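WP5 quarterly update. Target: Genome polyprotein: Picornain 3C. Source organism: Human poliovirus 1. Length: 180 aa.
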Amino acid sequence: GPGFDYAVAMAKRNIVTATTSKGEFTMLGVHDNVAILPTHASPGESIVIDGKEVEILDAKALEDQAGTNLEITIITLKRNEKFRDIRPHIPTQITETNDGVLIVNTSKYPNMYVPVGAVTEQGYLNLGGRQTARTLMYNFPTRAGQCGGVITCTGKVIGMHVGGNGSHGFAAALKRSYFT
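Structure tokens (predicted):
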């Protein structure tokens, strides 16, 4: 109900903690039983969501038209649980903002909000030996525990944190077409 933005309402149901062999990540539910995670989280046949082991029915790694990695993996879960449909709040185009907020939800940082400032288009990035397209950057001392963090601005969900270099944080841009 109360919440400085749409973000607060969505967060309670759609932002959960996911555990794969590579550790804890923040994960974003998009609609129904469909969620997203950074491709490098590498979920196997199942994943532990908020303490509960759940089976993955499908895991689609996204790439652009040229075959470049987007670093977003869409996973379809085997579970009656249903996320709110946030798609109407995902822009149809890569989106910058002067006032972004990063939302992280892990056991080390439960339901935490952090205004990060300007979020602008970085474009191609070398993400751990792999070329990644459509990235965004923000000036925030990135560290462990933020992978999967969601990036929002007033009424919109615009990126997902996928890496960072000491002074900057990088995210994959979200676009609506990826989910329809």
